[PDB]
């Protein structure tokens, strides 16, 4: 093989290179040829990711839950925790607002096979609620059907914690192992993501290659018009959420960012919120942060509190929805906010991360990728993920420090 | 929230309070209003429990099996073990007899939606037997289908034990962990039960509230006429099984019970056979019981040997069956005995315990709760569970001591 | 029970005894009586094995994969590993050639219920490839569907290894447990096989008993005509593969076998490649083998590198195929080679081993045992497994030593 380059550029090459190879084929040799020999690889890629969606949505939440089991965290955390949720809860709320002013997709409308998309009527409100509670975890889990799963995972995780406080040692010990195994399953699923991401370059080249053969050039407008909605959203996040809640705690924002200057750029280029933990802690002290404080929060916000992603999944949803020609009904629209948070708490904080947990938010809100259109749209954002992933990852780290700094203030 | 009362009364309040709120609505505002705003909560409750039914029927038996893996128990146990089964095997056999004289349900007959219940013809005997052996554990397990599951769990558990005797240490160690993880899954599922039971008060209030709006008052007769069948069954258990097998071993029954006086009342009020282990052992010595003897049996009979429940599940089945208008065919009727034992060996020995493992015995014997009628009946017993649960739990503990005392005699 | 004999003979008795009881009923009392009271037991047996097929195809490969995770093995192994695959890869390639000259089954053609067998058209090549990648591991696994499973297992296993090299200790530790649990699941599934094999005597008696009542005596020709294809294949394996690659490394083959004389006969009679490890190592030195060399290879080739089985599963497939009247299309025919290897790397190296992993190779290549014909054919080979199993097991061990000896030469 030999293929050793820095995946980041190593992927941007497929993106920029795929777009051109796609367009030239815009005219000339009809893309049909592309939809036959090129797209197949773009699909292999798309599936390798949906593969993971279940095992991670599960293992990922049983662990996430246990890392917030009230009570199971000093009240030094209770504070920080309430922090992460509200930051992320708002992060998405903001994303929807960007989706509003910016109508990414709207106009990009596609009917794939010639037929358009239409969702199945939601069962009576009563059943929609009772359905969140799986009737058979194994089953619900066995065959897609997210929510039910999420629900069971949180209940499993939070339950495991209380076993750890069990007077009995066998019990206290069993829980430790089981919880240990789950985790690992999830932690192992990431190795797979990282691995898959090594194929990202080829896959991305196929996806965008295809989206260019078809859809003409109009997609470039929508794709970029999407990115705009994201960043103008990410920077708003920081400016309207961070600085606003930093001057609220007598913290100099300006100088603040000058210290996180290394923690941000690091995460922004590596895209590995997790792999950028050391650089996030070095900066922890540098700005006079108490040891027992960033030693606890920075490592927790590395997986949880990915408000940078929550904004992503918020806008991503409206992109798909608008591209298909469907209008999200407030209710499912507020389901995104509720979901995106758990979906973000699910993200691994690695290259693939974000995108993968998007399916979680799509299956919920009725937009199965098993559908020609949805899968056709999803394949677009998944192609420009890298771009959105960078600015994404950066906010994730920021939110952490910005939380750690504020928690110190009142501790 | 604030809600801190002693669940036991805290639930009896919903029961007694729900019945009245139900009847007043007997006349006046037709219960239809109830079947619309009240029943939904009674259902949330009913599902939270069926949820657990699979993970526990599995983890619960893999562990139960390993705790009886012949050989894997001193022959000091072999004795005690043969004891528990036969006590429980008969406990149910007795329950069926109570179901006989007392026809709980019979006359309570309901057709829910207006249609009546009718079971699917059982496949040729040949297939019924071969079917107990799952063709794909994961599958069989994934989507309901008990028996197959039970079967695989026992085989898994008993198998794990033999790995622990493996000369090789890696093998011997692996088995230890895996077995450790399973357990925990089950031990964790109980935390959930306990949790769910914290909702019991609300749920019960809904269930019985509904059963009173409909069915008029005739249900009170059947419900109580059921309780009778149980207790007059539990006391018979003790009197015809315990005292009979106590005077058979030169053990003074009268005085006997005077010592277990604290172990019984304890379990009878806490309803936590497990949580009542310390009080069961304090009494262990008090009556001159050898250390190495109650140190081994009392802790084993805390989970296994729940002959108090086996009687429950025995009568419970005939209640449902009679309420629907179906006559249990001897064969499925003897299936209950065979099932109820494993179902009791599955019970956790906690508040929820009993009822939850009932579904296990229902899915077997063809009475899926996924059915309007069955689910309608089940919802009745599940409403008066607390009452039956107390006298239940008490016999569970008794059987333990009554076994420990006899095993000492011959050891 | 009492039943304590040496399963090996203890089974040959059922085989030889079943055949006679079958034929006498050839004439006289039509076998219909047999297909009603005899076959049912032959089926119980057949299912007990298919039961295991999934849990083992999974746990079995996650472990197998981790035991070859490149890199995760000294380069002292890389050598030995490349060895096992190529030996087994060719072992099967050879089996197909035996299936060619010998047309086991061809002529044995059956239509069970009166209808013949016909496979479902394979989806477009594109989908056949993308389908190997499961969309939902849990699902794919939950309900049969091998390949997808295999694929995920290898990716899980190989992934776990890289977690063990993780700087972080928690990560490094989690992977250890999870990997530990999986293994055990598989190691436990064998206990079940061994157990099931204790029923082998009865089961085999039923199977062949039936195949004799029907099919007349013509089956004896095919059954034996099959065995021939195997052995004349196993001996060719050794002579054309081993001796050829032994004189290639200045190793005296003749004398060679005189030392493995005990390691072979041992494995040949016990049929437990694994249980014959000690006798394989005693011989390790005896022939001047470096400690650090057979201490690493012999224990690895005990589970992996079962080229004796790979030849089995190679011919076994053509037996079934020919018996049904279907011609394996080169492509699925080369799928067998690719599958048989993983299928052999799946075998446990115990009595049942081989046969059980055959289903793995059948589900792949479209020949579900859920089909009257396939299941009818499979039931024949499964009846004479013991015979093929012995000569099988022997080559498995041989390949090990023959690999160890050659790796020492160049190390
Ligand atoms: N990979 C990003 C998260 C995401 O893309 O969703 C990170 O490093 O945190
Ligand atoms: N909860 C009871 C058992 C049951 O209700 O089935 C106990 O403590 O043993
Ligand atoms: N049981 C054989 C393998 C097989 O039958 O496939 C062994 O000992 O290696
Ligand atoms: Hg996906
Ligand atoms: Hg239930
Ligand atoms: Hg099989
Ligand atoms: Na996350
Ligand atoms: Na974060
Ligand atoms: Na139990
Ligand atoms: Na008990
Ligand atoms: Na193998
Ligand atoms: Na071998």
PDB file of C-alpha atoms in Angstrom, chain B residues 192-307:
ATOM      1  CA  UNK B 192     -34.063  -1.282  37.228  1.00  0.00           C
ATOM      2  CA  UNK B 193     -36.844  -3.334  38.816  1.00  0.00           C
ATOM      3  CA  UNK B 194     -36.368  -1.595  42.128  1.00  0.00           C
ATOM      4  CA  UNK B 195     -36.422   1.631  40.209  1.00  0.00           C
ATOM      5  CA  UNK B 196     -39.519   0.725  38.259  1.00  0.00           C
ATOM      6  CA  UNK B 197     -41.114  -0.276  41.541  1.00  0.00           C
ATOM      7  CA  UNK B 198     -40.672   3.266  42.632  1.00  0.00           C
ATOM      8  CA  UNK B 199     -43.247   3.997  39.927  1.00  0.00           C
ATOM      9  CA  UNK B 200     -45.332   1.073  41.117  1.00  0.00           C
ATOM     10  CA  UNK B 201     -47.527   3.400  43.225  1.00  0.00           C
ATOM     11  CA  UNK B 202     -48.586   5.421  40.164  1.00  0.00           C
ATOM     12  CA  UNK B 203     -48.824   2.406  37.861  1.00  0.00           C
ATOM     13  CA  UNK B 204     -50.888   0.336  40.270  1.00  0.00           C
ATOM     14  CA  UNK B 205     -53.209   3.296  40.776  1.00  0.00           C
ATOM     15  CA  UNK B 206     -53.825   3.330  37.030  1.00  0.00           C
ATOM     16  CA  UNK B 207     -54.245  -0.416  36.529  1.00  0.00           C
ATOM     17  CA  UNK B 208     -56.794  -1.108  39.264  1.00  0.00           C
ATOM     18  CA  UNK B 209     -58.353   2.312  38.565  1.00  0.00           C
ATOM     19  CA  UNK B 210     -59.149   1.025  35.109  1.00  0.00           C
ATOM     20  CA  UNK B 211     -60.140  -2.495  36.088  1.00  0.00           C
ATOM     21  CA  UNK B 212     -62.726  -0.826  38.359  1.00  0.00           C
ATOM     22  CA  UNK B 213     -64.141   1.554  35.788  1.00  0.00           C
ATOM     23  CA  UNK B 214     -64.782  -1.557  33.738  1.00  0.00           C
ATOM     24  CA  UNK B 215     -65.650  -5.016  34.965  1.00  0.00           C
ATOM     25  CA  UNK B 216     -67.807  -3.212  37.522  1.00  0.00           C
ATOM     26  CA  UNK B 217     -67.248  -4.544  41.018  1.00  0.00           C
ATOM     27  CA  UNK B 218     -67.341  -8.221  40.077  1.00  0.00           C
ATOM     28  CA  UNK B 219     -63.518  -8.034  39.836  1.00  0.00           C
ATOM     29  CA  UNK B 220     -63.146  -7.427  43.567  1.00  0.00           C
ATOM     30  CA  UNK B 221     -64.668 -10.862  44.062  1.00  0.00           C
ATOM     31  CA  UNK B 222     -62.250 -12.489  41.613  1.00  0.00           C
ATOM     32  CA  UNK B 223     -59.241 -10.535  42.873  1.00  0.00           C
ATOM     33  CA  UNK B 224     -59.921 -11.485  46.466  1.00  0.00           C
ATOM     34  CA  UNK B 225     -61.094 -14.938  45.425  1.00  0.00           C
ATOM     35  CA  UNK B 226     -57.581 -15.162  43.928  1.00  0.00           C
ATOM     36  CA  UNK B 227     -55.714 -14.015  46.995  1.00  0.00           C
ATOM     37  CA  UNK B 228     -57.575 -16.693  48.916  1.00  0.00           C
ATOM     38  CA  UNK B 229     -56.358 -19.385  46.518  1.00  0.00           C
ATOM     39  CA  UNK B 230     -52.814 -18.092  47.078  1.00  0.00           C
ATOM     40  CA  UNK B 231     -52.570 -17.858  50.896  1.00  0.00           C
ATOM     41  CA  UNK B 232     -54.756 -20.873  51.637  1.00  0.00           C
ATOM     42  CA  UNK B 233     -52.062 -22.292  49.374  1.00  0.00           C
ATOM     43  CA  UNK B 234     -49.042 -20.722  51.038  1.00  0.00           C
ATOM     44  CA  UNK B 235     -50.097 -21.812  54.518  1.00  0.00           C
ATOM     45  CA  UNK B 236     -50.820 -25.286  53.178  1.00  0.00           C
ATOM     46  CA  UNK B 237     -47.285 -25.242  51.733  1.00  0.00           C
ATOM     47  CA  UNK B 238     -45.770 -24.704  55.132  1.00  0.00           C
ATOM     48  CA  UNK B 239     -48.151 -26.949  57.067  1.00  0.00           C
ATOM     49  CA  UNK B 240     -48.206 -29.864  54.574  1.00  0.00           C
ATOM     50  CA  UNK B 241     -44.631 -29.503  53.327  1.00  0.00           C
ATOM     51  CA  UNK B 242     -42.501 -27.882  55.984  1.00  0.00           C
ATOM     52  CA  UNK B 243     -43.943 -29.199  59.301  1.00  0.00           C
ATOM     53  CA  UNK B 244     -44.417 -32.576  57.588  1.00  0.00           C
ATOM     54  CA  UNK B 245     -40.760 -32.702  56.583  1.00  0.00           C
ATOM     55  CA  UNK B 246     -39.643 -31.221  59.934  1.00  0.00           C
ATOM     56  CA  UNK B 247     -41.185 -33.824  62.153  1.00  0.00           C
ATOM     57  CA  UNK B 248     -39.706 -36.252  59.617  1.00  0.00           C
ATOM     58  CA  UNK B 249     -36.217 -35.041  60.771  1.00  0.00           C
ATOM     59  CA  UNK B 250     -36.821 -34.793  64.514  1.00  0.00           C
ATOM     60  CA  UNK B 251     -37.214 -31.023  64.316  1.00  0.00           C
ATOM     61  CA  UNK B 252     -39.681 -29.257  66.582  1.00  0.00           C
ATOM     62  CA  UNK B 253     -41.819 -27.234  64.120  1.00  0.00           C
ATOM     63  CA  UNK B 254     -43.695 -25.210  66.719  1.00  0.00           C
ATOM     64  CA  UNK B 255     -40.583 -23.873  68.477  1.00  0.00           C
ATOM     65  CA  UNK B 256     -38.935 -23.800  65.058  1.00  0.00           C
ATOM     66  CA  UNK B 257     -41.175 -21.024  63.810  1.00  0.00           C
ATOM     67  CA  UNK B 258     -40.707 -19.129  67.060  1.00  0.00           C
ATOM     68  CA  UNK B 259     -37.054 -18.551  66.030  1.00  0.00           C
ATOM     69  CA  UNK B 260     -37.776 -17.861  62.382  1.00  0.00           C
ATOM     70  CA  UNK B 261     -40.319 -15.454  63.842  1.00  0.00           C
ATOM     71  CA  UNK B 262     -37.964 -12.555  63.085  1.00  0.00           C
ATOM     72  CA  UNK B 263     -36.684 -13.889  59.763  1.00  0.00           C
ATOM     73  CA  UNK B 264     -40.252 -14.299  58.510  1.00  0.00           C
ATOM     74  CA  UNK B 265     -41.858 -11.038  59.622  1.00  0.00           C
ATOM     75  CA  UNK B 266     -38.769  -9.284  58.283  1.00  0.00           C
ATOM     76  CA  UNK B 267     -39.066 -10.784  54.825  1.00  0.00           C
ATOM     77  CA  UNK B 268     -42.857 -10.487  54.993  1.00  0.00           C
ATOM     78  CA  UNK B 269     -42.682  -6.689  55.377  1.00  0.00           C
ATOM     79  CA  UNK B 270     -39.628  -5.887  53.264  1.00  0.00           C
ATOM     80  CA  UNK B 271     -40.681  -8.265  50.536  1.00  0.00           C
ATOM     81  CA  UNK B 272     -36.961  -8.511  49.813  1.00  0.00           C
ATOM     82  CA  UNK B 273     -36.057 -12.142  50.314  1.00  0.00           C
ATOM     83  CA  UNK B 274     -32.535 -11.057  49.430  1.00  0.00           C
ATOM     84  CA  UNK B 275     -32.464  -7.992  51.672  1.00  0.00           C
ATOM     85  CA  UNK B 276     -33.723 -10.269  54.426  1.00  0.00           C
ATOM     86  CA  UNK B 277     -30.681 -12.543  54.312  1.00  0.00           C
ATOM     87  CA  UNK B 278     -28.905 -11.095  57.386  1.00  0.00           C
ATOM     88  CA  UNK B 279     -31.999 -11.570  59.531  1.00  0.00           C
ATOM     89  CA  UNK B 280     -32.252 -15.088  58.119  1.00  0.00           C
ATOM     90  CA  UNK B 281     -28.721 -15.942  59.201  1.00  0.00           C
ATOM     91  CA  UNK B 282     -28.855 -14.282  62.604  1.00  0.00           C
ATOM     92  CA  UNK B 283     -31.621 -16.792  63.159  1.00  0.00           C
ATOM     93  CA  UNK B 284     -29.433 -19.378  61.493  1.00  0.00           C
ATOM     94  CA  UNK B 285     -27.313 -19.858  64.610  1.00  0.00           C
ATOM     95  CA  UNK B 286     -29.827 -18.830  67.258  1.00  0.00           C
ATOM     96  CA  UNK B 287     -31.265 -22.255  66.508  1.00  0.00           C
ATOM     97  CA  UNK B 288     -27.858 -23.997  66.674  1.00  0.00           C
ATOM     98  CA  UNK B 289     -27.106 -24.162  62.977  1.00  0.00           C
ATOM     99  CA  UNK B 290     -23.575 -25.075  61.921  1.00  0.00           C
ATOM    100  CA  UNK B 291     -21.615 -22.132  60.449  1.00  0.00           C
ATOM    101  CA  UNK B 292     -20.403 -23.902  57.318  1.00  0.00           C
ATOM    102  CA  UNK B 293     -24.009 -24.967  56.758  1.00  0.00           C
ATOM    103  CA  UNK B 294     -26.148 -21.782  56.756  1.00  0.00           C
ATOM    104  CA  UNK B 295     -23.183 -19.899  55.340  1.00  0.00           C
ATOM    105  CA  UNK B 296     -23.704 -21.991  52.228  1.00  0.00           C
ATOM    106  CA  UNK B 297     -27.424 -22.704  52.009  1.00  0.00           C
ATOM    107  CA  UNK B 298     -29.113 -19.481  53.236  1.00  0.00           C
ATOM    108  CA  UNK B 299     -27.176 -17.418  50.635  1.00  0.00           C
ATOM    109  CA  UNK B 300     -28.037 -19.903  47.866  1.00  0.00           C
ATOM    110  CA  UNK B 301     -31.730 -20.159  48.700  1.00  0.00           C
ATOM    111  CA  UNK B 302     -31.859 -16.362  48.685  1.00  0.00           C
ATOM    112  CA  UNK B 303     -32.060 -16.378  44.912  1.00  0.00           C
ATOM    113  CA  UNK B 304     -32.885 -19.991  44.157  1.00  0.00           C
ATOM    114  CA  UNK B 305     -35.626 -21.999  45.910  1.00  0.00           C
ATOM    115  CA  UNK B 306     -38.427 -19.475  45.827  1.00  0.00           C
ATOM    116  CA  UNK B 307     -41.191 -22.012  46.374  1.00  0.00           C
TER     117      UNK B 307
END
